[PDB]
Amino acid sequence: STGSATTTPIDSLDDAYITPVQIGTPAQTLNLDFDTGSSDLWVFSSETTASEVDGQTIYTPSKSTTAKLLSGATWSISYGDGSSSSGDVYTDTVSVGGLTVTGQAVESAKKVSSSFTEDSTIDGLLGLAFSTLNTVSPTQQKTFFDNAKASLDSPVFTADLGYHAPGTYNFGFIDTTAYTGSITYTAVSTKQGFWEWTSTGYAVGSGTFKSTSIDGIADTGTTLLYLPATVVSAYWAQVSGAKSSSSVGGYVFPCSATLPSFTFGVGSARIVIPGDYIDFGPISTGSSSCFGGIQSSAGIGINIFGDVALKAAFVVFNGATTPTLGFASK
Template identity: 50%
Template sequence: MHFQQIVASLALTSLAVAAPLSEEKRASPSEKFTVFQDKQARPEGRKVAGPIALAEALGKYGRVGLSPSPAVKQAAAKAAAQDDGTVAANPEQFDQAYLSPVTIGGETLQLDFDTGSSDLKISYGDGSSASGDVYTDSVDIGGTTVNAQAVELAKTVSAAFASNEGDGLLGLAFSKINTVTPDQQKTFFDNAIPSLSEPLFAVDLKKGQAGTYDFGFIDDSKHTGEITYTPVDDSQGFWGFTTSGYKVGDGETVTEDINSIADTGTSLALLQDDVVSAYYAAVDGAENSQSEGGYIFPCDATLPDLTFQIEDYAAVVPGSFFNYAPASAEGQCFGGLQSSGDLGLSIFGDVFLKAQYVVFSNSPLQLGFAPKDL
């Protein structure tokens, strides 16, 4: 995501400009507003359910009048309802966004999964936006399918919006901040929860390579330690949580509550000024550049790690992750850690999230963090 779009998720409630929901009306391919297509990443099929196979076998070979036990029947019914799925998250240049294949009405689009918004369209808080009509259609993400999902089809887009890669956003925040009017709609995740093995999705973003989103299950092969859970504050419609301190490099831990949100739709880590200043004070040649709009540093500078305390888990972000992209000044690079300014909370975007294995759980309402191979 471009730097001017980093506050996107914080102003979506002011951008509700969609038409009323139409019944099962499918958009034609010609109405799409971009042409970017990547057919390389394809959804994987769902797993074979053991309880279903067991129930079928017992039913087939049982004597007349006999049937599987209630426990087997219950397990089979649960398995039949499971609609778990996994899908690739493919990075754009500089990891500015991750695009995943989503099948809508039989056509595969490339969407940016955004835990900082609740819409299946694109609109930004920096003045760029999209508006249009709302339809219902079948939406499939790697085997997790929701029928009659509200899909927001953009018909009018701003110039800033039109420059984006991909076909749109898929919001994974809470439905309470969905911007459709006059009838607010549920997110894909909320609609999918009844069919999932567990009411959660797990995110494994990676630096410079494809990661995954898993719906309904935790893949323990994707993390190297225990998952630490922390409560979520959803009062603003976001995946809000609190870190209790931070440490720059090998320095002392600073005890400080940092109210934050986990936002896969934001490229950078945006934190309060004292944290940002403390970090760049440890980087030779770093400066807060007015012309660049944020902190820059020599591209060959050695960047320290930054560690955040979440419950009893030390979440480490390698220093190399903060070298985000070349700046316009020769030999200078733009930092992946920047000030959150007057937002009133910190945004842990992809720079932080791709250094962790992250579980977004709806019930209980919590976030899980674990270390992984980087």
């Protein structure tokens, strides 16, 4: 089997991407944030505290003939950005782009933090990291991909995120028309539960490539590119007037600037992030200070190849017995 679904930016900045997902019988379609940095499929629901729902579409398990309470199971998750959610668990039928999993754990939120409430466009998350990170207790549950894997034509999924445009998540096949050149594969460590890999270096604009190992994670659920302070300083030094602002919470730059590209290495291959992908717009409405899309990972504890990086590539998440990651230009 295979599946193919379009993923759409939630706003004009590409802050996140939503993908329609069918849950239950008859189908209830919710727009979920596919997150390769976490491993829980959770949704706004009829159980979510009413004051914490503001415009989201909810899953109502009592209206699904295939829903079953997973008795005694609870979940609770906290994300790198400080947001959180928790609740109980159902199993139900879940379909993405025509690919169906029966008995998928659907984690129903009883509580969500303010950032989730305030984002009316995201109805929940669909985790695509390794199932070892799943938070369900006392019996850990499998991700949608883990459950689908054996049925797929090939044990892979791909992320093809758009810049200010829709893109695609495919399951079970590699669309050879969706990228240019060849796909370069690179080793993955699953020790921390992430799609963790080592970039071979970077360049800023038309500058020379610096060969240096940068360990980080491929994370579709993180907006920005978070890299070591040395690398980030080297980037922003090429933008007149750019500075790190403790009050704003990162590097800002004059909105009048033209940003240089940023290149990262994948083995001997190179992925180029155009400068415009690094512009996250005014820090507040009407400001002439703009927020940068490359930020320091210092104090996160891990480097994160988030959407800024991933949307410059066609990315293969290879879930073979020994997982790997592939990157192609597009």
